[PDB]
Each structure stands twice: as C-alpha cells, then as structure tokens.
Enzyme design. Structure first.
Site, PDB file in Angstrom:
ATOM      1  N   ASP A   7      54.677  16.710  37.394  1.00  0.00           N
ATOM      2  CA  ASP A   7      55.053  16.769  35.993  1.00  0.00           C
ATOM      3  C   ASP A   7      53.754  16.952  35.202  1.00  0.00           C
ATOM      4  OD1 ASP A   7      56.076  16.208  33.322  1.00  0.00           O
ATOM      5  OD2 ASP A   7      56.899  14.501  33.731  1.00  0.00           O
ATOM      6  N   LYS A  68      47.795  22.811  28.095  1.00  0.00           N
ATOM      7  CA  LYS A  68      49.006  23.603  28.065  1.00  0.00           C
ATOM      8  C   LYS A  68      49.224  24.380  26.813  1.00  0.00           C
ATOM      9  CE  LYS A  68      52.857  21.885  29.600  1.00  0.00           C
ATOM     10  NZ  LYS A  68      53.897  20.869  29.805  1.00  0.00           N
ATOM     11  N   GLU A 172      61.199  21.725  33.010  1.00  0.00           N
ATOM     12  CA  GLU A 172      61.208  20.291  32.722  1.00  0.00           C
ATOM     13  C   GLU A 172      62.647  19.727  32.659  1.00  0.00           C
ATOM     14  OE1 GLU A 172      59.319  19.066  28.946  1.00  0.00           O
ATOM     15  OE2 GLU A 172      59.285  17.255  29.292  1.00  0.00           O
ATOM     16  N   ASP A 196      64.026  15.700  25.320  1.00  0.00           N
ATOM     17  CA  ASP A 196      62.631  15.700  25.788  1.00  0.00           C
ATOM     18  C   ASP A 196      61.660  15.269  24.675  1.00  0.00           C
ATOM     19  OD1 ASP A 196      60.240  16.591  27.483  1.00  0.00           O
ATOM     20  OD2 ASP A 196      60.325  18.358  27.050  1.00  0.00           O
TER      21      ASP A 196
HETATM   22  N1  LIG Z   1      57.570   2.263  25.680  1.00  0.00           N
HETATM   23  C1  LIG Z   1      57.109   3.263  24.933  1.00  0.00           C
HETATM   24  N2  LIG Z   1      57.275   3.286  23.556  1.00  0.00           N
HETATM   25  C2  LIG Z   1      56.780   4.319  22.783  1.00  0.00           C
HETATM   26  N3  LIG Z   1      56.087   5.408  23.320  1.00  0.00           N
HETATM   27  C3  LIG Z   1      55.864   5.466  24.712  1.00  0.00           C
HETATM   28  C4  LIG Z   1      56.367   4.384  25.604  1.00  0.00           C
HETATM   29  N4  LIG Z   1      56.026   4.682  26.871  1.00  0.00           N
HETATM   30  C5  LIG Z   1      55.349   5.857  26.832  1.00  0.00           C
HETATM   31  N5  LIG Z   1      55.248   6.335  25.529  1.00  0.00           N
HETATM   32  C6  LIG Z   1      54.581   7.588  25.053  1.00  0.00           C
HETATM   33  O1  LIG Z   1      55.126   8.663  25.800  1.00  0.00           O
HETATM   34  C7  LIG Z   1      54.160   9.705  25.925  1.00  0.00           C
HETATM   35  C8  LIG Z   1      54.270  10.227  27.381  1.00  0.00           C
HETATM   36  O2  LIG Z   1      54.782  11.615  27.370  1.00  0.00           O
HETATM   37  P1  LIG Z   1      55.254  12.489  28.672  1.00  0.00           P
HETATM   38  O3  LIG Z   1      56.651  12.974  28.372  1.00  0.00           O
HETATM   39  O4  LIG Z   1      54.912  11.817  29.936  1.00  0.00           O
HETATM   40  O5  LIG Z   1      54.185  13.661  28.546  1.00  0.00           O
HETATM   41  P2  LIG Z   1      54.298  15.084  27.893  1.00  0.00           P
HETATM   42  O6  LIG Z   1      54.729  14.943  26.439  1.00  0.00           O
HETATM   43  O7  LIG Z   1      52.822  15.518  27.979  1.00  0.00           O
HETATM   44  O8  LIG Z   1      55.241  15.931  28.690  1.00  0.00           O
HETATM   45  C9  LIG Z   1      52.798   9.138  25.450  1.00  0.00           C
HETATM   46  O9  LIG Z   1      52.452   9.733  24.153  1.00  0.00           O
HETATM   47  C10 LIG Z   1      53.058   7.631  25.317  1.00  0.00           C
HETATM   48  O10 LIG Z   1      52.287   6.919  24.321  1.00  0.00           O
END
Ligand SMILES: Nc1ncnc2c1ncn2[C@@H]1O[C@H](COP(=O)(O)OP(=O)(O)O)[C@@H](O)[C@H]1O
Lengths: 511, 132, 132
Positions: A7, A68, A172, A196
């Site tokens: 991912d 990206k 995704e 997403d």
């Molecule tokens: N419990 C939570 N509450 C609020 N935000 C969260 C929580 N857990 C993770 N995040 C946020 O989720 C994001 C992770 O995104 P992800 O979908 O893995 O990556 P991408 O957007 O690069 O595809 C980070 O910005 C992080 O701060």
C-alpha cells in the site's frame, strides 16, 4: 514464503503477506505496520519511514515525501506546480520530469520521484522480508483508481528499482474490497461504496462486484482533503493559542510548529478512541513549555466542515454511478482518518444507520487486499480449489427416497466435492400440494438399507396430475462433505431444505 | 580478424527448423525484432533511473525501420543497451539452451512458430525471411 | 568393439527436422521400412537372374515383422541383398548426401514429411516413432 502487497501512499505505506487464508500485516523496525512515505536525505545516509518522519522538522529541506503527486507527471503539469509551492525541497524541470533536489552525503542531487518511491518500497520490502524470514520479490503495488497509465508504469518502475517483480498494479478500492472478502463469491451483483479518507487526499469509489469480477462505476474526490488538514486545524488551534497565551509568535518557527503538529497528530489519534487528548511539549518555543489540550467536541468543531465535506464527493459518486442510497449494499472504510467517530457517524447516518465495514484497520485494508492479490498472481492457488476437489470426494452416493422406497442418487460415489448436482422429480400421486424428500447415503437400491441423513418437506407445489409439477432436487455438497439438500418447484419459486452433518451348440451340429 | 563460432546445438536446430519448416506466418519476423528492441530500450531506461549516465551516449530511446530495396535490406535500429562482443558470442545475450530446448519440445507438442518469443529466443525468427 | 563414423551433415540436418516436426501421419514409418525392405528383395532377385549362387545363402524373399512389446522395439527382417560394411557406414547405402538436401528444399517449399521416400531417404522417418 508467499508474495506480498504494498500500500504505497502519499503520507503512509503498509505491507502484508498472504498465507494460510489470511494476510499477515507486517510491522516495521519500531513495531508499526503502517509507516510514513518519507525519505530523509542527510549527509550521512537516507533514513526511510518513521526515521525520516521523526526528523522532518530538522531537515525538511532535504526530506522528500508525498512522491506520488509528482510521479508520472510532467513538470509543467498544474498539479506539479500546485505541490512544488508547498515543499521544503526543490522541484526541477529536468526534461519535464520533475526531480527533487536535496543534499545527500553533501551533494545536491536531483532525485526523480520514482526513485523516491522505490526507496520507500525497498524499505517496505525489507520489512516484510525480515518478518517472513525470506527475500521477497513477488509483489502487488496499489495505486489510486484515478491514476493514468504514465502513473501506473511509473509505479511499476519504482518497484523494479527496488528489486520487485511487479506482478500487478491494482487500484486502492479494489484492494479494499478484496480485503473485506467482497470478492469471495456468493456476494455478486452488489454495489460497494468505498470511502478513502487518508492523509493528504480523499476519494470515493463505487464498485460493482459480480462473483469476484470487478467493475468501477464511479469515482469522486477531493485531492487535498485528508488527515493533514485536520492536523492543520488542530495546529491553528494550538498555534494561535500559544501565541496569545505567551505573546510569543510560534507560527514563524517552522520547527516549533512541526513539533506542535506532531503532537496534534498524536493527540488526534488518541482522541479518536478517547473523548479527550492533551498536548505536552517541553521548551516548544523560545524555551516555553506548552501545556494545553483538545477535547473531542472541540476537535470536531475545528474540523466540522472538513468532516461534512466528505459527503459531497459521496453524493457526486452516487450521481455519477446513477445510484440512490438504497442501491449501495456495502459500506467500506479505507484510511486511518475514517477512525475519527465523526467520519463514521456522518457516513453511517448518510446511509441511514447501516453498519460500516470496520473489520480491518482502515490503513491495513488496502495492503491486505494487495497481499491477497499478490498471492493469487504469483501462482493461481489460494487455499483452493483443486486440492479440495481431488482430496475430498463423496465416499458413498448421495440421493433421496422416492416413491417405491428406492434411492435416487444425484451425487455419484467418489465424485469430487464441492459440487452441485440436480434431477427433476414430480409428485408421485395426483394433485398433491407438496413432496416429502428423504435424504440418504449409501449404495443400496432400497432406502431401507441405506443411511438416512435427514428429511424435509417441499411445500408450494400446485396440485396437478402425477408427473406434472416440476421439482428440481439439488444435492449441494461442500468441500468438507457437509450436504445441503434443497428442492424447489420451478412453477412457483418455492423451496425448502435439509442440512446433513459431517462424518469426517446347434452351430456345431448337422441335420 | 574475424572469429568463427559454432552455434549451440539447440539453436543450430532451431534455425534449421525456422528456415526449413513451412511456417506461413512470416510477419512475426518484424514483430519479434521490434519487440526485442523494445526490451533493450527498457534495459537502459531502468538502469538510467539509478545510474543516469547510461544515457550520456544518447538520450533518445527509440526503434527505427529503414528499408533499402536496392540492396534487398531492412535495417532495424535499436537505440537500447546493445551488446558487448561477449554477448554477441554468447547467443546474442540469451539463455539459448533452456529456452530453445523447451520451445522445441513445445513444437514437438504442436506449438506454432509465433510462440518463439515466449521462450526468449524470438530473434532467431529473423531467418524466416532472411538469407543472412 | 564399437567404431564411430558420425553422419553426413545434410542427413544429420534432416534427421533433426524429422524429429522436431509436428507430424501426425506417422504410419509412413512402416510404409517406408517395408518399401526399403522390398527394394532389397528385388535387388537380390535381379542378381539371381545372372548369378543364381546369390540365392545359396537363403532363397526365400520375404519380410518378417515381429513387434517386441517387452523390448519396446519393432523388428523388420528382409532376406534381400544386405549391406556391406561400407554401405552401412556411408550414410546407410543410399545417396543420403544428395537425397536429404533435395528433400529439405522440397520441405522449404511446403512438401510433406510423407514425401521422404521419394528422395530415397525414407528410412530416416523411423525417428518419428523411434528414439534409436
Ligand atoms: N485514529 C486516527 N484518528 C485520526 N487520524 C488518523 C488515525 N489513525 C491514522 N490517522 C491518519 O491517517 C493517515 C494515514 O493515511 P493512509 O490512508 O495510510 O495513507 P495515504 O493517504 O497516504 O494513502 C495519517 O495522516 C494519519 O495521521
């Protein structure tokens, strides 16, 4: 040692391996399954993952992340222009292929975004390998559903730079649907809505799944909406507060703001399971210790529009897919930011209280799906189907008592299972409203000498002369030998069943 | 000075089959040579991602086709990585024995000549129409 | 005592083409083995017309087919002229050195494998079903 899926996000990435019917999501050096899409170029080495994220404030000018947005794009692309104004590093028009110039071991080399993401993929490769105890090249890399073909090739190439055999580039939302088992079959002809909400972006995608076959009906999104702006609202709360409380303008110190932001990220993640979270930073700015707090309600107020706006692309996706709310069967979450209670409440209320699929951590579900797909692609066997068919057979013929007290087999002895077999029966006598099916196991012609497995009644049969009603009797046997005998009257659509448990000379003369 | 080499038996046999077996789909000649040039072009392009100097000798990655009827010839130019003396000698850079043997087995089983590229020995198809 | 002579290159080439060609009408195998046996029988019959002593080593002219499932072999025996050591080593006594090349040109032009007997090299068809 199975194939893996990665991912690859803008802010975060995650790797899993598919084996034994499940995907094992693999932790990095510090125990984190999901780690930042950051590479920090220092004058001693390039740090990757949490290690790069942890020092963004100290070396932002040489830390490259969110590759990206630039990958697969031309330098002159409005998106490239839009993002370079936000980065601490220099973006260069090297043949209309934007490169990032940062100092690595003292040299201001221009690093192309595909190598930046390959650095990230290499780290993810290493994480999975350490865990699995085996070098891994067979992989699936996910991309946003909207990526075009230059972008998809660019992703494959980042994989090749990292030493991966890119089996496939998949979307995704497809991966998430896979992770949640919506492709396991028997769940066909269903519409799946994937929400997403990540770090720097928000996307909505509506999928139709037909017994493992996928079609994407619509997409919608907000290329700048995600956790980063929820962090920025929390930052403005704390930055303006700091300034007013102390009469010290912290907003002008990029490091103090970034330390505050890091605390905002921690507090926000904590706040999603809590009702309250705090900020505690020693010597944050001009030697000032900044101790303060955020409640969940305040967080929601700060970000109330950021949360509500996520439903605007939902309505757009529904319009593009020509679907009403009622036509979405499956609600799916993707992205850590969906872990915030307000997001869940808004999407769930929008769809009239229907439960969201939260069974897999939102940041793991995409990697999860990629890993499942990687395992089938590396060689098309995934806890099925040929071994089940060759090893498990019906040990005795399976059939039913029919008039005369005799057994009619539908599944023949030593036939491979799982399998579905049928025959047509009618009521024995004239003008009956239903039939009595007695299910048996064995090789004797008479039912009195066989193993009765169970009995059921098929109702809903129009009375007609014997031989007229058309009843299909089905012997549906699974891999473990469990037998489901059903029957239906084709003229009315009515049906019933029984579940059977598992055992496991003249020519030489003259005249 | 010109060095003379033998072909390894699997390919000496393959080339004999290409020339003497009555295959009608002669068009795979051009298809395979263009495809193989593409692979060479990618070999550089991938190396140039971590070592850009591979393009210092010429930034353009492309395929040229140039017929000259008066000499009964066609030139196909691959601006991809190319081969060293050693690779030309060593089967033009491929694993000729394993690929070709499996292919000959596939041909014995009923495979078409169009599958030659699937074994990584596609360039021997040049002799479908080439004298030389 | 096993003396090695090795084969004329052109016939070795034909055997490779026969072996590696996807030919289904393998019945020509026995047709050619019998035809060649017959030719040996007629040659001795003609010799006996001017020199009858050639029949004093056996007189009968016939072909014996004996399958040997237990050996996985087929034995074909003719009581004809036989072959001298020289003929046996000189590409089996036929002008294989001419006939296989002419056949291969015919194959380049679309001739069938079944036409091999027309070039006087019919017995190489044995390798359609034989390994040795
Ligand atoms: N419990 C939570 N509450 C609020 N935000 C969260 C929580 N857990 C993770 N995040 C946020 O989720 C994001 C992770 O995104 P992800 O979908 O893995 O990556 P991408 O957007 O690069 O595809 C980070 O910005 C992080 O701060």
């Amino acid at each position: 040692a199975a194939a893996i899926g990665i991912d690859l996000g803008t802010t975060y990435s995650c790797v899993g391996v598919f084996q034994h019917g499940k995907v094992e999501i693999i932790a990095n050096d510090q125990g984190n399954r999901t780690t930042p899409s950051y590479v920090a170029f220092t004058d001693t080495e390039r740090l990757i993952g949490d290690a790069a994220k942890n020092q963004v404030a100290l070396n932002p000018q040489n830390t490259v992340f969110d590759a990206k947005r630039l990958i697969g794009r031309k330098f002159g692309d409005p998106v490239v222009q839009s993002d370079m104004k936000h980065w601490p590093f220099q973006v260069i028009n090297d043949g209309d292929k934007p490169k990032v110039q940062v100092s690595y071991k003292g040299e201001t080399k221009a690093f192309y975004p595909e190598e930046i993401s390959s650095m990230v993929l290499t780290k993810m490769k290493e994480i999975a390998e350490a865990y699995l105890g085996y070098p891994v090249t067979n992989a699936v890399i996910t991309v946003p559903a909207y990526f075009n073909d230059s972008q998809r090739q660019a992703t494959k190439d980042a994989g090749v730079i990292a030493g991966l055999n890119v089996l496939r580039i998949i979307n995704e939302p497809t991966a998430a649907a896979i992770a949640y088992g919506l492709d396991r079959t028997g769940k066909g002809e269903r519409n799946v809505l994937i929400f997403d909400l990540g770090g720097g972006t928000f996307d909505v995608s509506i999928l139709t799944i037909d017994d493992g076959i996928f079609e994407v009906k619509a997409t919608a999104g907000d290329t700048h909406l995600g956790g980063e702006d929820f962090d920025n609202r929390l930052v403005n709360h704390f930055v303006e507060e700091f300034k007013r409380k102390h009469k010290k303008d912290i907003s002008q110190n990029k490091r103090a703001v970034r330390r505050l932001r890091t605390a905002c990220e921690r507090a926000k993640r904590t706040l999603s399971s809590s009702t309250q979270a705090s900020l505690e930073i020693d010597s944050l700015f001009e030697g000032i210790d900044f101790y303060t707090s955020i409640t969940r309600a305040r967080f929601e107020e700060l970000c109330s529009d950021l949360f509500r706006s996520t439903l605007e692309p939902v309505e757009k996706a529904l319009r593009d897919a020509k679907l009403d709310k009622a036509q979405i069967h499956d609600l799916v979450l993707v992205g850590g930011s969906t872990r915030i209670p307000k997001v869940q409440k808004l999407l769930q209320d929008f769809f009239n209280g229907r439960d969201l699929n939260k069974s897999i951590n939102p940041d793991e579900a995409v990697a999860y799906g990629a890993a499942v797909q990687a395992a089938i692609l590396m060689g098309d066997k995934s806890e099925n189907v040929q071994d089940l068919l060759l090893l498990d057979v019906a040990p005795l013929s399976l059939g039913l008592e029919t008039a005369g007290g005799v057994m009619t087999a539908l599944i023949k002895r030593n036939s491979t299972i799982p399998t579905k077999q049928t025959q047509i029966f009618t009521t024995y006598s004239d003008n009956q409203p239903g039939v009595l099916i007695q299910v048996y196991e064995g090789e004797r012609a008479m039912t009195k000498d066989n193993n009765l497995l169970g009995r059921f009644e098929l109702s809903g049969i129009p009375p007609a002369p014997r031989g007229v009603p058309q009843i299909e009797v089905t012997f549906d046997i699974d891999a473990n030998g469990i037998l489901n005998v059903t029957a239906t009257d084709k003229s009315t659509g009515k049906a019933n069943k029984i579940t059977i448990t598992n055992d496991k000379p003249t020519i030489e003369e003259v005249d | 000075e010109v060095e003379t080499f033998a072909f390894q038996a699997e390919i000496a046999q393959l080339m004999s089959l290409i020339i003497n077996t009555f295959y009608s789909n002669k068009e795979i000649f051009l298809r395979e040579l263009i495809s193989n040039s593409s692979d060479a072009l990618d070999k550089i392009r991938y190396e140039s991602l971590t070592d850009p100097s591979k393009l210092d000798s010429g930034k353009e990655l492309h395929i040229n086709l140039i017929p000259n009827k008066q000499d009964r010839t066609l030139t196909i130019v691959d601006t991809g990585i190319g081969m060293t003396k050693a690779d030309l000698i060593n089967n033009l850079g491929t694993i000729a024995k394993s690929g070709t043997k499996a292919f000959m087995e596939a041909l014995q089983a009923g495979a078409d000549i169009s599958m030659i590229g699937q074994f990584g020995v596609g360039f021997y198809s040049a002799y479908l129409v080439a004298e030389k």
